[PDB]
């Protein structure tokens, strides 16, 4: 169908999303943005009914749908994508689950989703990789994205390839881990952070951008690479993270392999690690500065600086002596440009 009513929760739009990865961090956001517009949204889930219960407010009566399905089965994926007009994809896992090898997460599954999306006659199959995807010996998960990027690029050739970099949000793994270091005590870094630089991307912007990307006919085979407003060097970046966390800061150098070993000690747990050999290099990798790829403002959405977003994300960690403190007083981290 086609839109009716003022753009809101009760007004309609023709959207029929099938957001894989809704269970995770980004997914609840993108579902919030599809749902806020009054578009109906399928939400296929595997974790459990309880895990996504919090999403129920986001919809309005009929606007949301929930669907259990096995990743291992193909036919279930066929069922969930049937009436889909658009099919957003967000399946991933940084630390690599034991029972499901990391390979499948960015190879077999994205491909099946792509072919079946083609059979579904999906108006807009969409896939989200990362700005660091060009093949690197570092970060197999990062390396795997490139293969998923291509397989998705082929099985469903007009698929968009989103490449967000270090999106930071309230529940972001990347921002929180840095904040969580105070419990660790000491602050190791691979040759500190001076060699490497990053340009982190705010998540609500990425989500609303996915929405407007769905809204744009013009995008198709386009390989979007989302980028942050500012290109901070990693070390001064951590400086800022505790500068707002107000926690004691004691940086020191640590060899990449030696840090890699401790990360390996932390990978032993079936319980999810705060640290992993993927995370090591995925941190130590620099963000590529790409101009040629389409701008964020092409979607019409302005980039939102981390300094305007940080304290809410990190207030929970700052001590009561600081937990009620004014925002302006931390002073912004130094920019490489």
């Amino acid at each position: 169908l086609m839109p009716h009513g003022k753009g809101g929760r009760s007004s309609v739009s023709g959207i029929v999303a099938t957001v894989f990865g809704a269970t995770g961090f980004l997914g609840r956001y993108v579902v919030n943005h599809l749902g806020r517009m009054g578009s109906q949204v399928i939400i296929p889930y595997r974790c459990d009914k309880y895990d996504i219960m919090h999403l129920r407010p986001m919809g309005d009566l009929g606007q949301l749908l929930f669907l259990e399905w096995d990743a291992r089965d193909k036919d279930s994926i066929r069922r969930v994508v049937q009436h889909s007009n658009v099919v957003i994809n967000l399946i991933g896992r940084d630390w690599e689950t034991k029972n499901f090898d990391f390979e499948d997460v960015f190879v077999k599954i994205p491909q099946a989703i792509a072919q079946l999306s083609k059979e579904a006659g999906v108006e807009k199959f969409i896939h989200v990789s990362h700005l660091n995807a060009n093949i690197k010996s570092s970060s197999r998960y990062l390396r795997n994205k490139a293969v998923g990027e291509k397989v998705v690029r082929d099985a469903f050739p007009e698929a968009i390839i989103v490449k967000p970099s270090d999106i930071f949000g309230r529940e972001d793994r990347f921002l929180n881990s840095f904040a969580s270091m105070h419990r660790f005590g000491p602050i190791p870094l691979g040759s500190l952070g001076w060699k490497t630089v990053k340009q982190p991307v705010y998540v609500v912007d990425v989500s609303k951008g996915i929405v407007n990307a769905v809204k744009d006919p013009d995008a198709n085979g386009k390989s979007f690479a989302f980028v942050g407003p500012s290109r901070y060097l990693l070390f001064h970046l951590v400086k800022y993270i505790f500068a707002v966390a107000h926690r004691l800061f004691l940086p020191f150098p640590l060899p990449l392999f030696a840090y890699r070993w401790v990360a390996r000690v932390f990978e032993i747990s079936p319980f999810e690690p705060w640290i992993t050999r993927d995370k090591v290099e995925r941190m130590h990798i620099t963000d590529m500065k790409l101009p040629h790829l389409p701008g964020l403002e092409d979607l019409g959405i302005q980039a939102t600086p981390l300094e305007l977003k940080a304290i809410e994300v990190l207030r929970r960690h700052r001590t009561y002596r600081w937990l009620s403190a004014e925002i302006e007083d931390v002073k912004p981290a130094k920019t490489v440009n």
Binding site: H4, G5, K6, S10, S11, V12, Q40, L61, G62, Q63
Partner: protein, 118 residues
């Protein structure tokens, strides 16, 4: 122009977007009763109301749409729309013109009224 545009709580959007309709309501065609032609009333212009995707219900846009207001006189209603800041359109009263009638007027060979069997 004693505008109470801010003194009222109404959104500026609903006062900008539309004019209201001042008028005197019409008598039922299907019914004899003249009784509701009396007393002026003012009503806002209807907007689009998309169907509810579920259960096929009405899904109204503008909240204020069901408003209705009686008035003793026309200048009264004009005064309200002026006080309140909304645009309006005055409409005239429609009392039917008197018609001469008589029982015998139906008859008479010459008048070609005649009617017929009774």
């Amino acid at each position: 122009k004693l505008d109470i545009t801010t003194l009222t709580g109404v959104p500026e959007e609903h006062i900008k977007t539309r004019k209201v309709r001042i008028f005197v309501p019409a008598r039922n065609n299907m019914q004899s009763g003249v009784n509701n032609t009396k007393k002026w009333k003012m009503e806002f212009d209807t907007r689009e109301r998309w169907e509810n995707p579920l259960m096929g219900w009405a899904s109204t846009a503008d909240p204020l749409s069901n408003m209705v207001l009686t008035f003793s006189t026309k200048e009264d209603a004009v005064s309200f729309a002026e006080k309140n800041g909304w645009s309006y359109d005055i409409e005239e009263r429609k009392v039917p013109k008197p018609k001469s009638k008589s029982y015998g007027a139906n008859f008479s060979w010459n008048k070609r009224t005649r009617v017929s069997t009774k």
